[PDB]
């Protein structure tokens, strides 16, 4: 099976620098050209680099041309993007993706590895404030997440046990910083008479926060 | 450069239905265009190449067509698995400009938002914060407008909105709309509305409180 994993994403500061690697296998490598295209935060799609199969020649659009360096390791398989003077607008979902081999030829890219995140902010590590949301035959409870970086908390509702009739809202950046939310609707007859508890994770900063609604 | 666009930015469809998207180019592109297909939270896939062949391994229910600046995909009869973003990509000549995609969603009927609203919590107040939360929960079609009133007159400021994507169960749309102000502030008025109009009716919804 043709395999392409991307990693070397993270988090960095405006002027940073990451350098992403994409490990091929399942296929000969250095037969076929290797793009990296990026989706943003609006889920647009750009090609930022293409590079052939010998790794002779590039290609880069203006957005990074001069920032963003492709290379590939013929040897060992990998592909990889150096990207430096990172910028806010470079936030995006990182590809790697091969490129068919066409005749005629077309530029068409008929694998796509999962991709890897890359995020570039002024923010450091920071915890959410959770605040539940009580009403004070189906009753509406919530959990507020505010103010968190980076853009990364999952909320389950009983451990996953109510799953079905749970709402996850898209977490917003406002000051640098995300909110996020999350309902969940239960029977009446259910709560206050059995607990419902929102548990909120956020990796970056330790944080698990299980809030009971009350 | 060749700049594309793509219509329309969102489509509802029924199982079993003929679907066509469209997709245009700022000047003859000759064929040299592309289709991927992205689903929520996957990578794209190839769908399409130089304007009307199939991938290998896709299904032939999807189609391309067009020359010269206008190009179309056909799905012959829509599966619930093709709930995606369709992209269109032209490679005649450099930068390769994506489309800004369509997305497809699926059809049912009509549903009013169940609307909630929530005052500060005590946690936050305790913090010196404000924020009232509105939900508008589990409506159909996508299309919603929410307005907040303290006092009777409406707010705008401090206003934040987010929206789900289809529900993947029963297809419906979801909303949530926080007020956000200073606990000084929310201690100068008494009543906070949040109103909710959707084409399920001609009144709004409308849900409310008093501090």
């Known amino acids: 099976e043709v395999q392409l994993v991307e990693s070397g994403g993270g988090v960095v500061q405006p002027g940073g620098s990451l350098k992403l690697s994409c490990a091929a296998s399942g296929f000969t490598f250095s037969t076929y050209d290797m793009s990296w295209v990026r989706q943003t935060p609006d889920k647009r799609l750009e090609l930022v680099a293409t590079i052939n199969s010998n790794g002779g020649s590039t290609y880069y659009p203006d957005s990074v041309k001069g920032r963003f360096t492709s290379s590939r390791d013929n040897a060992k398989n990998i592909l990889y993007l150096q990207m430096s003077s990172l910028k806010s607008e470079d936030t995006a979902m990182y590809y790697c993706?091969?490129?068919?081999?066409?005749?005629?030829?077309?530029?068409?890219?008929?694998?796509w590895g999962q991709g890897t995140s890359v995020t570039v902010s002024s923010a450091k590590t920071t915890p959410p404030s959770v605040y539940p949301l009580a009403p004070g035959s189906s009753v509406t409870l919530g959990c507020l997440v505010k103010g968190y970086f980076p853009e990364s908390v999952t909320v389950t509702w009983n451990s996953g046990s109510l799953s079905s009739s749970v709402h996850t809202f898209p977490a917003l950046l406002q000051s640098g910083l995300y909110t996020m939310s999350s309902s969940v609707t239960v029977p009446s007859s259910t709560w206050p008479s059995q607990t419902v508890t929102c548990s909120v994770a956020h990796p970056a900063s330790s944080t698990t926060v299980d809030k009971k609604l009350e | 450069d060749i700049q594309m666009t793509q219509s329309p930015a969102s489509l509802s469809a029924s199982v079993g239905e003929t679907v066509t998207i469209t997709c245009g180019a700022s000047?003859?592109?000759?064929?040299?265009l592309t289709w991927y297909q992205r689903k929520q939270g996957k990578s794209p896939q190839l769908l399409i190449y130089?304007?009307?062949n199939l991938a290998d391994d896709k299904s032939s229910r999807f189609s391309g067509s067009g020359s010269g600046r206008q190009y179309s995909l056909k799905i012959s009869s829509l599966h619930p698995d093709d709930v995606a973003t369709y992209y269109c990509?032209?490679?005649?000549?450099?930068?390769?400009?994506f489309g800004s995609g369509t997305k497809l969603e699926i059809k049912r009927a009509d549903a009013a938002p169940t609307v909630s609203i929530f005052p500060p919590s005590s946690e936050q107040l305790t913090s010196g914060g404000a924020s009232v939360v509105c939900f508008l929960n589990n409506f159909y079609p996508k299309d919603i407008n929410v307005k907040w009133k303290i006092d009777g007159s409406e707010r705008q400021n401090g206003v934040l909105n987010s929206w789900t994507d289809q529900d993947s169960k029963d297809s419906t749309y979801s909303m949530s709309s926080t007020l956000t102000l200073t606990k000084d502030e929310y201690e100068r008025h008494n009543s906070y509305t949040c109103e909710a109009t959707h084409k399920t009716s001609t009144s709004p919804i409308v849900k409310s409180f008093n501090r």
């Open positions: 990509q032209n490679v005649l000549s450099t930068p390769f400009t």
């Open positions: 130089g304007a009307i």
């Open positions: 000047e003859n592109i000759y064929g040299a």
């Open positions: 993706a091969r490129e068919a081999l066409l005749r005629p030829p077309y530029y068409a890219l008929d694998y």
